[PDB]
Design a protein around this nucleic acid. Structure first.
Lengths: 68, 177, 238, 11, 37, 357, 125
RNA sequence: GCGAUGAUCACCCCUUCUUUUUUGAAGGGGUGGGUACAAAUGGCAGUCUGACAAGU
C-alpha cells in the first residue's frame, strides 16, 4: 500500500544489502574474470568461426558497388 | 490410448481393461457398465475412460497391432493365474514337508530359508549362528530387535531339524516353539 | 564441467519459470514437465524435495534463440506460468519444450510448423507434453488453423523468412490479446544480406509499428549467434 | 609392451 | 610406438612400473645376500 | 473425433460440410438475414448454396470474432476451458497426422519394439525351459540328453506325465522313431523317483506355458516379417526380415540408418572389434551385422568380404528409397532389381578361379 | 610411428569431447542492447535503475539482473579457471591432431598412382 | 515365579540488581553406507579405406 515508514524503508534496505552481499560470492571476484574472459573469447572464436561471414559481407558489398 | 495408462496404474487391472477396450473409439453406455463392472466405480475410472477415450491423443494402431496387444495382454493374465496356483502349491507342499518350520515363520519365508541353505538337510546341519546370517541378506528373521532375530533364528534351527530327520513331521512342536 | 555426479545449487531467475543452477558454473535451467527423459539430449539436473524427486532440464543458449536472449538480459519476457503462447516456426521440441516448461501445466504452447519432416519430430514430443498443441500449418495463412487456437498472451516467432513481418501481423491481429506480448527473433541474412545487419533490424522495427505493435526492447544475440537479435514489443490495438 | 610405448599429448 | 592415453590408463601404467621397480629392487637385493653367503 | 477431423478439414479447404449445411438450413426460415463468416472462401462457398443470406466477410468482423473466441468458454455453457483445450489438443494431433500422410502401417517404432521383445521372449522361454528340465528331470533325469529341443521336451511331459505312461503313450508326432523308442527304454531303467499328482499338475502347467511361449514367439516372428515388409519392403528382399530389423534397431530409426553411409552399414554390428582394431593398428572387421545375410552365406572365401561391401552399398540404395520416398509402392521393386545386380556380381566373382588352369 | 586410421579416431574423440566440454562452460553475453522510448523528455530522464528496477550493481550484470523488490573461494574460482583451460587444450590437441593428419593424408596422396607432373590434367580410366 | 532346548556382549543438527546482611532475585530430522529390481537419447564411446579390377 506504499505506507512504508522511515524504519520500514531501512529494514528492507538492509535486506537489499544482505541479499546482494551474498550474491557477490556466487558472482565471484573480479580478477579471475580477467583470466576467464581472456580464455572465453579464444574458445568462442574458433567454435563460432564467422571470419568467413565477416569476409563474405565485404565481398558482396564490394561486388555490389559500381567500379569506376 | 496413453491416458488409460495413467487412469488405472494396477498393471494386472490394465490387461483385462485393454482386453475389453481394444479400441477407444468403441464407447457405449452398456460398454461403460461392462467396464464399470471391471473393478469398481468408486475410483471413477469408468466415467474417465469414456471421457478420455472420446478426447485422447493416442494414435490408432493397426488391427494386427491390436491383435498382439490383447494376445500379449492375454499372456500376462495366464502367468499371474499360474503364479497364484503355484503359490498355493508351495504353501501346501511346505506344510507337508516342513510343518514345524512353516508354522513358526511362514511358508514362503521357510521356502526362502530352505533355498538359502540349498536343502532342508543342509539347513538342519548348520549351527544356530550360521542360520541367522543365512537369511540376514534379505532380512528373513526380522539392539532389542536383534535379540529377537537371534532368538527366532535358534528356534528356526530346531524347527528345521524336527522337519528333516522325521519321516512324518507334525506341527505340534512348531506351535509351542 | 557440470558432470553427471556434480552437485549444483538451483535458485530462481528474475523471470518466472526460469532457474539458475549455481555451482562451479551457472546454467540456465527450466523445470522438466515430463521428468525422466530429455527431448534433444540436454543434460538434466535432479533434486530431492519433500521426498519427491523433481527434475529440471538445462537450456543451451547456442541451440535456443530465446535462451540466448535470457543470457543477454532481456528486460521483459511475456512467456510466464499461466499464459497461453503462440510459437511460430516450431521446427521441433528443442525450444518449444523449454517454452512449454515455463508456462507450466496450467499454460499452453501453440506450436506452428510447416515442413513435414520436422513436424513428425514435433508431434512425437507433443505427446509427452499434454500442454503443447502441434499445429502443422503455414503461418502465412492463419485463417486455415483458426480451428485450433484461442487468444494468446504472447506471440513468439523464430520463422526465418523474408516476409516474416506479415506473418506476425496476421497472427497477432487474429489471436493476440490487446496489450499482448510480441517477441521476434530476426536474422539479417535471410531478409536482406546485401545491407548491414543494423539497417535490416531498423527496417523490421518500422514494420512492427505500422502493424500497431509498439516495440519495447531490442537485443542482439552474440556471442551465441551473429547478425541476430530479439525484438520485444506490445500489441496496442487502440 | 608398455615399455615399447611412449605417451604423448599428456593431460 | 606412440599412443595418447586416457586418465584411467596412465594411472594403471604408472603403477605397474612402480611394481616392477620394487619387484626388481626386492629381487635384486636377495641375490647378493645369498651371493655373499 | 473422426467426424471432427473430416469437418475440421472441410473448414480448412473452405468447403461447406453436410453438418454445416443442416445447421444453416434450420435457420432458413428467417428471410433477409446477414451471415457473418470469418473467411472469404467459406463465405463464398456458403453463398453458392442458394441460401437466403447476405454473407459478409470483411476486416471489421474480425473484431467480432476476436471478442467471441476470447469469451467463448463462458459463451458456451456446459463446457469448461480445460475441456476445450483437451478437445483442441485431440483435434490437433488427429489433423496433425492427416497432413503428414501418417499411416498406422508405416511406423518404424514397432519394428524396434518387436525385435527387442523377440529377444526378450527367447531369454525367458529359455529360462523356463531349463527349470522344466531339472524339475521334471528329478522324475526322469535323462530326457534332457535325448531330446534337446525345449518345445519337444515340454510336449513329451504333456503327452505323458509319468514314466509308467511311456509303455503305452505314443510320441510319434513329437519325436522320430529312433528317438521315441530311446525315451521309452530309458523310462523303465530310469533313475528318477515317483512324483505325486499334485506335483504332476503343476509341472504340466509349466510345460503348458512352454509350448504356448513357443507358439506366441512364432506369431511375433511372422509379425515382424509383416511389419518389416510394409515399412521397408526393399530391404526385406535384399538383406532379409531378421537382419533388416536388427539393422534398423541398431540405428534406432529408419531415417537414422538411412542417413548412415554404406561403409557404416557394412560394419554396424562390430563396433567392439572395429574400434579395437583402429586403436591398435590391426585389420578391421569387414562384415558387421550383415554376416548373417543369405547372400553373404552363399559367398565363399574372400568373396564373402567383397559381397559384404557390394551388398552394403545396395542396402543403402534400397534403404533410402524405403525411408525418403513420399509415394513408395509397397512392392520392393528397387530392392528386387538390386538383388539381381548383387547376384550377378556374386556369380561372376564366384565363377572366377584363383588357381591357374 | 602411427597410421592414419588411429589419428582420425583420436581427433574425433577430442572433437566431441570439445563439444561436450564447451556445452558445460558458461559464457557471458556480448550482444548489444537498445531501448525504444516514446519522447525526448522520457528519453532524457531514462536511467537503467528505473527501467529494470535494479541497483547499479544489478545493472552491470546483464545475465541475472534481479529486480530490487526481489532482492528485498580462491580454490573454487581457481578450479573454474582450469576447466576453461582443459577445454582450451582439447582445442590445442585437436588442431595438433588435425595438423598431423593432412601430412599423413598428403604422403598417401603423393604415393597414389598418378601423372604427377603438381598433378597433370588427366582423366582417370 | 530366568538361562547350554543358549544368559551376556557410522557422522552431524559467570553478568546485572538487591540487603540489618556473609542476603535474595533476573539472565525428532538430515547426511553416509549395504542388499535386490527397474529406467537413462547418461559415461567409457570414436562408426573402416576410397580407384582401379578382370581378360586377349
Amino acid at each position: 500500500e506504499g505506507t512504508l515508514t522511515d524504519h520500514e524503508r531501512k529494514y528492507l534496505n538492509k535486506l537489499i544489502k544482505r541479499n546482494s552481499q551474498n550474491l557477490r560470492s556466487w558472482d565471484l571476484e573480479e580478477e579471475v574474470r580477467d583470466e576467464l574472459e581472456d580464455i572465453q573469447q579464444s574458445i568462442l572464436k574458433d567454435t563460432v568461426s564467422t571470419a568467413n561471414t565477416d569476409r563474405s559481407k565485404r565481398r558482396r558489398f564490394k561486388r555490389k558497388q559500381f567500379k569506376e | 490410448f496413453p491416458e488409460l495408462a495413467k487412469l488405472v496404474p494396477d498393471n494386472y487391472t490394465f490387461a483385462k481393461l485393454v482386453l475389453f477396450i481394444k479400441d477407444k473409439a468403441s464407447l457405449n453406455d452398456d460398454s461403460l457398465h461392462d467396464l464399470a463392472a471391471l473393478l469398481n466405480e468408486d475410483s471413477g475410472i469408468a466415467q474417465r475412460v469414456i471421457d478420455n477415450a472420446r478426447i485422447s491423443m493416442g494414435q490408432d494402431i493397426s488391427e494386427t497391432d491390436m491383435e498382439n496387444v490383447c494376445v500379449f495382454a492375454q499372456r500376462v493374465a495366464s502367468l499371474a493365474d499360474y503364479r497364484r496356483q503355484l503359490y498355493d502349491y508351495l504353501c501346501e507342499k511346505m506344510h507337508t514337508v516342513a510343518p514345524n518350520l512353516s508354522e513358526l515363520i511362514g511358508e514362503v519365508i521357510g521356502a526362502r530359508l530352505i533355498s538359502h541353505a540349498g536343502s532342508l538337510t543342509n539347513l538342519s546341519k548348520q549351527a544356530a549362528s550360521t542360520v541367522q546370517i543365512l537369511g540376514a541378506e534379505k532380512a528373513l528373521f526380522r539392539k532389542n530387535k536383534g535379540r529377537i532375530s537371534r532368538y527366532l533364528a535358534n528356534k528356526c534351527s530346531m524347527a528345521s531339524r524336527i522337519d528333516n530327520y522325521s519321516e512324518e513331521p507334525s506341527n505340534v512342536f512348531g506351535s509351542v516353539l | 564441467g557440470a558432470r553427471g555426479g556434480a552437485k549444483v545449487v538451483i535458485e530462481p531467475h528474475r523471470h518466472a519459470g526460469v532457474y539458475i543452477a549455481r555451482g562451479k558454473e551457472d546454467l540456465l535451467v527450466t523445470k522438466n514437465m515430463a521428468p525422466g527423459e530429455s527431448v534433444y539430449g540436454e543434460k538434466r539436473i535432479s533434486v530431492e524435495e519433500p521426498p519427491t524427486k523433481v527434475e529440471y532440464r538445462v537450456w543451451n543458449p547456442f541451440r535456443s534463440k530465446l535462451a540466448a536472449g535470457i543470457m543477454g538480459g532481456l528486460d521483459e519476457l511475456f512467456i510466464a506460468p499461466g499464459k497461453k503462447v503462440l510459437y511460430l516456426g516450431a521446427a521441433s521440441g528443442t525450444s518449444v519444450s523449454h517454452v512449454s516448461d515455463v508456462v507450466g501445466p496450467e499454460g499452453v504452447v501453440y506450436a506452428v510448423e510447416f515442413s513435414h519432416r520436422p513436424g513428425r519430430e514435433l508431434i512425437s514430443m507433443a505427446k509427452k507434453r499434454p500442454n503443447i498443441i502441434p499445429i502443422i500449418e503455414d503461418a502465412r495463412h492463419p485463417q486455415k488453423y483458426r480451428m485450433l487456437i484461442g487468444m494468446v498472451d504472447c506471440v513468439f516467432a523464430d520463422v526465418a523468412q523474408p516476409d516474416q513481418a506479415r506473418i506476425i501481423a496476421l497472427n497477432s491481429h487474429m489471436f493476440l490479446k490487446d496489450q499482448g506480448g510480441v517477441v521476434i527473433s530476426i536474422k539479417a541474412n535471410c531478409i536482406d544480406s546485401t545491407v548491414d545487419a543494423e539497417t535490416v533490424f531498423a527496417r523490421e522495427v518500422q514494420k512492427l509499428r505500422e502493424e500497431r505493435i509498439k516495440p519495447l526492447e531490442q537485443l542482439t544475440l552474440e556471442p551465441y549467434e551473429r547478425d541476430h537479435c530479439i525484438v520485444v514489443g506490445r500489441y496496442m490495438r487502440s | 609392451e608398455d615399455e615399447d610405448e611412449e605417451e604423448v599429448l599428456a593431460m | 610406438r606412440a599412443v595418447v592415453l586416457g586418465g584411467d590408463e596412465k594411472k594403471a601404467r604408472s603403477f605397474i612400473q612402480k611394481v616392477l621397480t620394487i619387484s626388481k629392487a626386492k629381487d635384486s637385493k636377495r641375490k647378493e645376500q645369498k651371493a655373499s653367503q | 473425433a473422426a467426424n471432427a477431423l473430416e469437418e475440421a478439414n472441410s473448414i480448412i479447404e473452405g468447403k461447406v460440410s453436410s453438418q454445416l449445411e443442416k445447421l444453416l438450413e434450420e435457420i432458413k426460415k428467417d428471410k433477409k438475414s446477414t451471415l457473418i463468416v470469418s473467411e472469404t472462401k467459406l463465405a463464398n462457398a456458403i453463398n453458392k448454396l442458394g441460401l437466403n443470406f447476405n454473407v459478409v466477410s470483411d476486416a471489421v468482423t474480425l473484431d467480432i470474432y476476436r471478442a467471441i473466441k476470447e469469451y467463448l468458454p463462458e459463451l458456451l455453457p456446459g463446457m469448461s476451458d480445460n475441456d476445450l483445450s483437451k478437445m483442441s489438443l485431440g483435434l490437433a494431433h488427429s489433423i496433425g497426422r492427416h497432413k503428414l500422410k501418417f499411416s498406422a502401417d508405416k511406423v518404424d517404432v514397432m519394428i524396434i519394439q518387436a525385435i527387442a521383445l523377440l529377444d526378450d521372449l527367447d531369454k525367458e522361454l529359455n529360462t523356463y525351459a531349463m527349470r522344466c528340465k531339472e524339475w521334471y528331470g528329478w522324475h526322469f533325469p535323462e530326457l534332457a540328453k535325448i531330446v534337446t529341443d525345449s518345445v519337444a521336451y515340454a510336449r513329451i511331459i504333456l503327452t505323458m506325465g509319468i514314466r509308467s505312461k511311456a509303455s503305452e503313450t505314443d510320441l510319434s508326432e513329437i519325436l522320430p522313431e529312433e528317438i521315441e523308442e530311446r525315451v521309452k527304454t530309458a523310462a523303465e531303467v530310469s533313475m528318477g523317483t515317483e512324483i505325486t499328482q499334485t506335483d504332476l499338475d503343476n509341472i504340466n502347467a509349466l510345460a503348458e506355458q512352454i509350448v504356448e511361449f513357443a507358439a506366441y514367439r512364432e506369431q511375433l516372428s511372422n509379425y515382424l516379417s509383416a511389419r518389416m515388409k510394409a515399412i521397408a519392403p526393399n530391404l526385406t528382399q535384399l538383406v532379409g526380415e531378421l537382419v533388416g530389423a536388427r539393422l534398423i534397431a541398431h540405428s534406432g530409426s529408419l531415417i537414422s540408418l538411412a542417413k548412415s553411409p554404406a561403409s557404416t552399414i557394412q560394419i554396424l554390428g562390430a563396433e567392439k572389434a572395429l574400434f579395437r582394431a583402429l586403436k591398435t593398428k590391426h585389420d578391421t572387421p569387414k562384415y558387421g551385422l550383415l554376416y548373417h545375410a543369405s547372400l553373404v552365406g552363399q559367398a565363399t572365401g574372400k568373396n564373402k568380404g567383397k559381397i559384404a561391401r557390394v551388398l552394403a552399398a545396395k542396402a543403402a540404395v534400397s534403404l533410402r528409397y524405403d525411408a525418403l520416398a513420399e509415394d513408395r509402392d509397397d512392392s520392393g521393386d528397387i530392392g528386387l532389381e538390386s538383388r539381381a545386380k548383387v547376384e550377378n556380381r556374386l556369380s561372376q566373382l564366384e565363377g572366377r578361379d584363383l588357381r591357374t588352369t | 610411428t602411427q597410421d592414419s586410421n588411429y589419428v582420425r579416431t583420436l581427433r574425433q574423440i577430442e572433437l566431441k569431447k570439445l563439444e561436450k566440454g564447451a556445452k558445460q562452460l558458461m559464457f557471458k553475453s556480448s550482444g548489444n542492447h537498445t531501448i525504444f522510448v516514446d519522447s525526448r523528455e522520457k528519453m532524457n530522464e531514462f536511467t537503467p535503475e528505473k527501467f529494470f528496477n535494479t541497483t547499479s550493481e544489478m545493472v552491470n550484470r546483464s545475465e541475472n539482473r534481479l529486480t530490487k523488490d526481489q532482492l528485498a573461494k580462491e580454490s573454487l574460482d581457481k578450479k573454474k579457471l582450469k576447466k576453461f583451460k582443459q577445454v582450451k587444450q582439447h582445442l590445442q590437441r585437436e588442431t595438433q591432431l588435425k595438423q598431423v593428419q593432412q601430412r599423413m593424408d598428403a604422403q598417401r596422396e603423393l604415393l597414389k598412382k598418378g601423372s604427377k607432373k603438381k598433378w597433370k590434367k588427366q582423366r582417370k580410366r
